[PDB]
Amino acid sequence: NYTDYFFDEPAFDLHDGGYVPLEVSDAPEKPLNVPPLLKPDKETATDVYYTVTAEAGETQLLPGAKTKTWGYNTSLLGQTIVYRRGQHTHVTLKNTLPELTTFHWHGANVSGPYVDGGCHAPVYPGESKHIDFTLEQPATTLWLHAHPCPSTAEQVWHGLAAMVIVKDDHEASLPLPRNYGVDDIPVILQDRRFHENNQWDYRADYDPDGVAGPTAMINGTINPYFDVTTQKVRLRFLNGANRREWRLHFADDLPFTQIGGDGSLLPEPVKFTHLMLTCAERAEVIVDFGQYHEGDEVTLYTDDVPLLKFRIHAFKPDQTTLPDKLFDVKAPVVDPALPVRHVVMQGMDEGVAIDGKKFAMQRIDATQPIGKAQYWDVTNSNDAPGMVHPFHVHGTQFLVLSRNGHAPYPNEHGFKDTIGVNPGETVRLLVRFDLPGVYMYHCHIIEHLDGGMMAQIETFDPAKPKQEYKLMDMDTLMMALAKERGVKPSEIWMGGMQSYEKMGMKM
Q: Which residues bind Ag ion (CB under 5 A)?
A: 149, 209, 348, 361, 387, 474, 507
> Least separation, in Å, of the C-beta of 188 and Ag ion?
24
Alpha-carbon gap, residue 466 to 459, rounded angstroms: 10
Say which entry of Ag ion, Cu ion, none residue 354 contacts (CB below 5 to 8 A, set by partner kind). Answer: none
Ramachandran class of 338: left when φ > 0, alpha when ψ lies in -120 to 50, beta otherwise: beta
Integer Cα distance of 219 and 162 in angstroms: 9
User: Which residue is closest to Cu ion by CB?
Assistant: 443
Q: How far is CA 30 from the centre of its chain?
A: 25
The size of the interface with Cu ion (CB under 5 A), counted in residues, is 8
Closest distance of CB 304 from Ag ion, Å: 22
Which does residue 222 touch among Ag ion, Cu ion, none (CB within 5 to 8 A, set by kind)? none
507 binds, among Cu ion, Ag ion, none (CB under 5 to 8 A by kind): Ag ion
- CB 434 to Cu ion: min, Å: 15
Q: Does 106 bind Cu ion (CB under 5 A)?
A: yes
Sheet holding 256-260, edge to edge: 215-218, 184-192, 232-239, 282-288, 256-260, 265-272
The binder of 445, among Ag ion, Cu ion, none, by C-beta within 5 to 8 A per type, is Cu ion
Q: Return the bridge partners of 398, or none.
A: 416
Minimal distance, residue 174 CB to Cu ion, in Å: 27
Residue 394 touching Cu ion (CB under 5 A): yes
247 binds Cu ion (CB under 5 A): no
- Identify which range of 40-48, 59-67, 103-111, 236-244 contacts Cu ion by CB under 5 A: 103-111
Pick 334 or 474: Cβ nearer Ag ion:
474
| AA letter at 427 | V
Length of the chain: 507
Q: Is residue 5 a contact partner of residue 274, using CB atoms and an 8 Å limit?
A: yes
What is the DSSP code string of 304-359? Answer: TEEEEEEEE-----------S-S----PPPB-TTSPPEEEEEE--GGG-EETTB--
Cα–Cα separations (whole angstroms), residue 271 to 260, 288, 298: 12, 11, 18
Q: Of these partners, Ag ion, Cu ion, none, which one is at the site of residue 241 (CB under 5 to 8 Å by kind)?
A: none
The reply on whether position 443 binds Cu ion by CB under 5 A is yes
- 472 contacts Cu ion (rule: CB under 5 A): no
Neighbour count for residue 317 (Cβ, 10 Å): 6
Tell me if 259 sits within 8 A of 326, measured CB to CB: yes
Q: Which one of Cu ion, Ag ion, none interacts with residue 389, CB within 5 to 8 A by kind?
A: Cu ion
Contact between 121 and Cu ion by CB under 5 A: the answer reads: no
Give min distance, CB of 13 to Ag ion, in A.
Answer: 9
Rounded to a whole number of angstroms, the minimum distance from the CB of residue 418 to Cu ion is: 8
Q: Among Cu ion, Ag ion, none, what binds residue 394 when CB lies within 5 to 8 Å by partner kind? A: Cu ion
Q: Per CB under 5 A, which of residues 280..339 are in contact with Cu ion? A: 280
What minimum distance in Å lies between the beta carbon of 21 and Ag ion? 16
Give CA separation, 117 vs 113, 224, 279, 293, in Å.
Answer: 6, 32, 19, 47
Q: Which does 234 bind (CB under 5 to 8 A by kind): Cu ion, Ag ion, none?
A: none
3 state SS for 148-192: CCCCHHHHHHHCCEEEEEEECHHHHCCCCCCCECCCEEEEEEEEE
Binding of Cu ion by 119 (CB under 5 A): no
389 contributes a contact to Cu ion by CB under 5 A: yes
Which residues fall within 8 angstroms of residue 323, CB to CB, at 6 or more apart? 174, 175
Which of 302, 415, 448, 459 touches Cu ion (CB under 5 A)? 448
Contacts of 200 (CB under 8 A, 6+ apart): 67, 68, 69, 157, 158, 192, 193, 194
Using the rule CB under 5 A, give the single segment among 73-81, 168-176, 184-192, 441-449 that binds Cu ion.
441-449
Binding stretches for Cu ion (CB under 5 A): 106, 280, 389, 394, 440, 443, 445, 448
